[PDB]
Write a new protein. Structure first.
Lengths: 238, 164, 177, 177, 164, 177, 164
């Protein structure tokens, strides 16, 4: 038979090619790294305080359907925005997997491994922007200044991207309020041993990921680690 | 592509809403003010070759040191590529008159411009000289209408707010 | 992300032309029909929520194969997700009517939507019958030719904007096929 | 954030009051004097890159202690950071006069603006001398009494809109004190 | 500051490790090369008033257009503010010869320079002529030693590569 | 952060002078004792595993109240963290000996630590006895006067390097007690 | 060789005087207007083949009668002597922009030219039409600087005046 462009009737080459198997190995390391980064959260037999979905019975299932629509929007990116997502997650994982050449070797091949590590290593030493509650309005206005610059690529030319968007359906965005309002309280009502492990790891996170030998950026991070945990990668438009 | 239609539907798509009555009303603003900026569009389009020669030589009228050897106007083809860029900026201000906003400047003339002129050793103070010579050369009821000169020149001094 | 204004900009960008008098006559027609354009889409945004349940449950009584057990409309979880993207596809053609062009569509809605219905197992033969019922609704609401909904309006012609939204639904109907 | 339009909502929502016939004349005054308000902020954003150099270099001839060793404008990062928040407070007050209310300053700029400066070591009186120079440029451009740049305008009075932008910089000036 | 000492302590702090013999041998480079990079330290510090005067007018010799009004060289106290800036820079080049790295130039002269010079209408090409005139007027056995002349010029054209 | 070579920069930048023949006698001597300094860090990287166990069990033989139930060594989780942070401050002073200055201690060790240790229930009396006993273990390795382990070195006086680490340990043992 | 220096001391020798305080001011004008006449001269030196190729066939596109039997360019040796005699003239225009006065033109190119060209039947109007072709070929921001075009088009129509 000849190709499907002339005088055929069904789509062919339904076979596991090289690029599908390359996507298949990379999805499986994504289910291993996210397994291993959840091991620090659930380290004993019980689920921790921050592995929670929601509070309302309709809101716990709305966390998945938002996140299932969130992972479609990373797939729905443009070809320039996919390639800038490709190499920037390569760069932020060598800073993550620092001292090993073997751990540096694996991320340069597998591309969804790079998104899996630097999202989970942010949530292993809890340097996320959700898990930190600043102790005062001195640290809060330092934390509220930096993330608005991190929101400045949600609109790159004054028009919004899809990556900053949180409403996907009718009445969707109100669950996205109360899931983070409860996450702000549970971070505030976390244990006293964990929150000072948060500030020291986040001020160690910002000095190696964004300062790079700068005395001024290390000094504000050691004064305000809440602003250090709001600092993220620029591949995330939000 | 910052425009009237584009920034109002991306805010609706950020929250996932339909275009509500706040969103149809912004396009109603693109009938009254869209008569003035589109009337200045073919005024610039019909007379563009007389602009970039007669307002393009004001770069080397004030900044006469660029012709000298060493700097950016040292020969003919770097002088010829200088008149091409003010003609590039005259298209992108003519393209901003028809999108109703700051669209084709912010993607094709502004973003990344402040790193190109550094590494190519092009003085941006010479770029704002030939633009501000077009900014004050405005006899208001003779180029265009009385309000068409406001919306045309609003993108000119926005560019001087961007290049400087 | 573009519209009907910026479509003639990138058409004139590639030939390095200023927008002359032959290109503004479509744009001067576009601002002369802008009052009809907002009056067209304000019948779409008016009762879109009943229009989706008219369409996808109208497809269910048309094709009862999906509500068979094991099918694509069996689970209470699964039918809610079909109502989730049943109104998204009505939302993204409403963005195509404000913009005056379908350039907003295939980069934010139809980009990769074709293979993700194949890989998840969504039957694409019923999805074209799903989007055609809202196509039959949207040519009725902007022509004021519904059965049970006549709205207050100003009379005239809307046959040109009837074919513009009807060219947007089979743009979905050929891309996701 | 709030504006002048929806300020009469929240003042009448706490008393459960309709916005009826007694409250229409405060908003129809915001409409007929609203075409001046678009002519108001057009004089601000046209020259906003040169107002910030007018202000910070106006602070050095008034106070040359900033460029001293130990001064707060000594490091070339610190001059750019002093130049960075020159227009950030100017971008926010341009939002307020379009809004008609200074609420957007009071939750996106001024919530904690005072005590973060003194913990960083920013002097208050130089930032007072920053905004009082920028108050003087704001009233100068808005009536076109600026002595080296005149723009084309329609004739009339903008003293009320001169006082409106002057009622914002002292709100900046009293909160950081 | 970014120096030889400050790099390997941050590399060991990134790994969470003690300073081993890779980090220990980096300071061995501050034993043989610090005899030559400090040879050109006090030659600049002992002659800082001579290099500022007959290279600060070499800025104005190449660019004599600043003496027209509206520019930066229009009055004497602006020129008195102009010689202070290249006296600031050669203080920073002396600060980076005594530190080993390029720290004090980066933390105090280059970071934020591309934002101030565009808004204040200061040409960075006019900065770079005063910097680069000190590079090629420098005689190798006369001004300093042979290896110090390679060392002092290498910090000098970093600033040329910083501004362009 | 700072170091020893950067300290004479910011001492000269505190008056915006240069670095000439006045401040260079401390720095032209610094390269001469650099081979003493690089041999001092090589002594302390060799033996860090026992000298934290020399310290955190010497804290036990004078204070067994943390293995008493309700202490801070009753838990095997907590006894790792007393061993993990017994060497981090040993890692930071070996950073400070390589840097020639204790600049990395007042941001990565000292600042925040007193506000840390109140929120953990840390006994403050255990802080001073841990660092001062390993202070004598530190200078015994530096002056080669360790009475159960010797080392081969090059001859010369080394008490200037023993006093420099003696100026570091009383910094961190002061504020957190 | 009439220049600025070789006239103020050919008048200081005609009265038996020292270098006056008048004549030390006339060499201060040689400092100012040098940078427009050197940069007009160096532009002519790297472009000479191009400008005398176009100037020479402006004679022969205009005057087709010169290839007739007995006329000026009647064979290929005479065409080669025509393009030589406009290569000489713009070399002297390059020389006058270095000396700064009209010295090298009127003692190497103009003196004798009324008597040489009359005897050999070489027309003056064909010599003028080649030089007057490149006088208005000069484009003011594109080719050289603004004032550099003034110096270059001062010696050109000096030569058009002295030939006609
Ligand atoms: C992208 C990252 C955004 C920027 C920048 C921003 O300012 N807001 C993000 C997108 C966005 N969303 C709206 C409208 C809503 N946003 C909501 C989310 C808030 N609710 C929460 O629980 C949290 C977590 C703290 C947040 C931020 C909600 C709710 C809405 C209203 C949706 C509704 O009522 O239907 C907007 C404004 C556009 C608009 O039409 O309102 C933007 C820019
Ligand atoms: C005081 C602040 C000013 C001044 C203001 C006035 N502006 C007047 C009229 C006016 N301005 C505009 C353009 C404006 N409307 C828009 O929609 C947009 C942008 C999209 C802009 C910039 C218009 C359209 C008008 C109405 C009249 C016209 O068509 O030109 C005005 C007259 C009263 C009024 O119409 O409100 C005044 C007094 N004028 C001044 O002299 C000072 C400097
Ligand atoms: C003349 C008034 C200017 C000047 C212009 C020069 N530009 C040179 C290169 C250059 N410029 C741009 C930006 C411009 N080109 C575009 O296509 C667009 C957008 C549509 C813009 C704004 C680019 C991208 C480039 C590089 C490629 C090119 O040559 O077009 C240039 C040559 C520099 C070089 O080759 O190294 C000159 C001389 N220079 C001046 O002195 C004044 C300010
Ligand atoms: C006091 C704390 C010590 C002690 C210190 C001394 N060390 C001396 C000399 C020395 N050490 C090294 C090796 C060191 N330098 C490096 O560059 C590297 C790694 C890259 C290391 C490990 C060298 C090379 C030298 C110089 C002499 C040699 O070549 O071996 C020293 C002599 C004085 C001086 O050289 O300035 C002293 C006093 N010695 C002691 O006895 C106590 C324990
Ligand atoms: C071309 C534009 C003319 C043309 C010219 C011919 N010129 C002939 C000879 C010639 N040209 C010069 C002047 C020239 N010689 C110099 O040394 C200098 C300055 C340094 C200059 C400008 C001279 C003195 C002569 C005569 C001596 C000689 O042969 O070199 C010439 C030959 C003369 C003849 O036919 O016998 C021609 C044909 N011919 C043209 O058609 C246009 C008018
Ligand atoms: C899919 C690919 C894949 C990888 C590349 C690795 C990467 C990796 N390693 C670790 C976890 C670890 N990784 C190491 C390895 C090293 N630490 C060092 O100090 C050495 C320099 C380096 C050896 C080269 C060690 C020792 C641990 C356990 C303790 C720790 O986290 O440091 C973790 C967190 C899980 C945990 O806490 O145990 C991850 C994601 N694991 C993977 O699943
Ligand atoms: C390693 C262990 C590990 C976990 C315990 C979970 C952590 C986790 N992430 C999310 C859910 C999410 N987590 C993120 C991640 C981030 N958000 C940001 O602003 C930062 C840039 C970044 C790290 C903090 C995002 C973007 C979502 C979806 C939106 C959201 O609910 O915040 C939820 C749902 C609850 C909620 O946040 O509303 C949970 C439990 N994921 C993990 O991988
Ligand atoms: C922000 C909210 C907003 C709107 C809702 C519209 C409202 C609107 N519709 C029309 C006006 C009109 N609208 C239509 C369109 C139609 N008439 C029908 O019966 C069909 C249902 C539909 C065909 C597609 C026609 C035919 C006219 C009159 C002709 C015209 O104005 O061009 C007009 C102009 C006449 C008038 O001023 O009343 C306006 C303002 N514009 C807005 O700014
Ligand atoms: C499409 C865009 C467009 C404009 C913005 C104007 C602007 C403008 N005016 C002139 C050219 C001129 N412009 C004026 C006008 C004036 N001189 C004054 O002092 C008054 C303020 C004002 C009366 C309204 C005059 C008198 C000339 C001729 C003088 C000259 O050569 O510049 C030129 C040079 C080429 C030309 O003549 O067109 C340009 C671009 N004309 C245009 O085609
Ligand atoms: C098995 C059950 C079953 C149905 C329910 C209908 C569903 C249905 N309705 C329409 C056709 C239509 N459907 C609607 C939709 C609606 N009318 C409204 O006023 C509301 C907004 C919304 C219901 C809540 C409209 C407006 C039309 C156009 C004709 C009209 O009703 O006036 C069409 C396409 C053309 C047609 O077949 O008629 C279909 C399949 N058909 C079926 O076989
Ligand atoms: C030490 C140095 C020094 C300066 C630079 C000026 C700076 C300066 N200018 C003004 C006063 C002003 N400053 C501006 C600002 C500008 N003018 C423009 O046309 C541009 C758009 C922008 C400069 C790029 C304006 C518009 C006025 C009002 C008067 C006018 O220029 O018409 C004021 C307030 C009035 C006062 O208190 O005296 C100051 C401090 N004054 C100084 O003492
Ligand atoms: C709230 C606290 C706070 C900080 C700690 C900094 C941190 C910081 N720096 C940059 C942005 C930057 N940061 C630097 C870094 C440096 N610049 C220099 O002159 C030094 C060499 C080096 C500091 C050591 C550079 C060069 C940029 C511009 C390029 C970039 O976006 O990275 C950005 C991105 C947005 C922006 O440009 O502001 C942020 C958040 N900014 C803040 O608002
Ligand atoms: C820190 C760096 C450092 C220096 C730059 C010199 C200091 C120095 N020497 C000269 C001065 C000089 N420098 C030279 C040397 C030369 N001239 C040439 O033409 C040759 C290319 C080159 C020889 C290799 C000469 C001949 C003079 C005297 C003439 C002059 O430049 O004024 C000048 C400029 C004129 C002056 O002020 O005297 C300076 C700054 N010593 C130092 O320690
Ligand atoms: C209560 C229980 C108890 C202990 C566990 C030991 C622990 C201990 N060791 C030392 C004192 C010391 N401890 C060490 C550490 C070591 N010595 C070596 O030779 C090895 C290299 C390394 C073990 C791996 C060193 C080097 C000294 C200094 C004296 C020396 O050993 O020469 C001190 C300080 C003595 C003082 O000043 O009073 C203490 C308390 N002693 C006790 O009373």
């Amino acid at each position: 038979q000849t190709g499907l462009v002339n005088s055929k009737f069904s789509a062919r080459m339904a076979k596991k090619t090289a690029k599908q198997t390359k996507n298949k190995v990379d999805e499986y390391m994504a289910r291993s790294v996210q397994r291993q980064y959840k091991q620090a959260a659930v380290a004993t037999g019980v689920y921790g305080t921050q592995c929670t979905e929601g509070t309302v019975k309709g809101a716990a299932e709305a966390s998945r359907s938002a996140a299932l629509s969130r992972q479609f929007r990373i797939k729905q990116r443009s070809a320039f925005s996919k390639a800038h997502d490709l190499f920037e997650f390569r760069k932020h994982a060598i800073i993550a997997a620092a001292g090993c050449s073997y751990e540096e070797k694996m991320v340069t091949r597998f591309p969804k491994l790079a998104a899996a590590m630097v999202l989970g290593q942010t949530e292993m030493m809890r340097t996320c922007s959700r898990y930190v509650v600043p102790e005062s309005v001195e640290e809060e206005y330092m934390a509220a200044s930096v993330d608005k610059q991190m929101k400045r690529r949600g609109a790159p030319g004054g028009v919004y991207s899809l990556s900053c968007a949180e409403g996907v359906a009718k009445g969707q965005a109100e669950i996205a309020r109360v899931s983070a309002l409860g996450a702000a309280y549970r971070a505030a009502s976390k244990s006293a041993s964990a929150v000072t492990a948060e500030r020291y790891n986040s001020m160690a996170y910002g000095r190696v990921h964004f300062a790079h030998g700068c005395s001024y950026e290390e000094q504000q991070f050691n004064k305000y680690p809440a602003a250090a945990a709001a600092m993220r990668s620029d591949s995330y438009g939000y | 592509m910052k425009s009237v239609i584009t920034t109002v539907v991306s805010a609706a798509d950020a929250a996932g809403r339909f275009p509500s009555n706040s969103d149809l009303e912004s396009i109603q603003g693109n009938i009254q003010r869209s008569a003035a900026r589109l009337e200045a569009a073919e005024k610039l389009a019909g007379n563009h070759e007389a602009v970039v020669k007669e307002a393009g030589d004001a770069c080397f009228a004030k900044y006469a040191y660029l012709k000298n050897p060493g700097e950016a106007g040292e020969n003919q083809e770097k002088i010829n590529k200088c008149y091409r860029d003010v003609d590039h900026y005259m298209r992108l201000v003519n393209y901003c008159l028809v999108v109703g906003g700051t669209g084709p400047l912010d993607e094709w003339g502004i973003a990344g411009a402040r790193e190109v002129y550094r590494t190519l050793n092009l003085p941006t103070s010479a770029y704002v000289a030939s633009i501000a010579y077009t900014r004050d050369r405005l006899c208001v009821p003779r180029d265009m209408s009385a309000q068409a000169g406001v919306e045309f020149s609003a993108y000119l001094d926005y560019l001087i707010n961007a290049l400087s | 992300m573009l519209d009907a204004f910026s479509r003639v900009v990138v058409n004139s960008d590639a030939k390095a032309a200023y927008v002359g008098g032959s290109d503004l006559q479509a744009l001067k027609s576009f601002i002369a029909d802008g009052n009809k354009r907002l009056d067209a889409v304000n019948s779409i945004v008016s009762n879109a929520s009943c229009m989706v349940s008219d369409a996808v449950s109208g497809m269910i009584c048309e094709n009862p194969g999906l509500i068979s057990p094991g099918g694509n409309c069996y689970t209470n979880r699964r039918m809610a997700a079909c109502l989730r993207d049943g109104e998204i596809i009505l939302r993204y053609v409403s963005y195509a009517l404000l913009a005056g062009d379908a350039s907003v569509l295939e980069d934010r809605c139809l980009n990769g939507l074709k293979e993700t219905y194949i890989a998840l197992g969504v039957p694409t033969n019923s999805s074209i019958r799903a989007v055609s019922i809202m196509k039959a609704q949207a040519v009725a609401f902007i022509t004021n030719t519904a059965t049970e909904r006549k709205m207050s309006f100003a009379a005239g012609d809307c046959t040109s904007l009837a074919s513009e939204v009807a060219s947007y639904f089979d743009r979905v109907g050929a891309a996701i096929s």
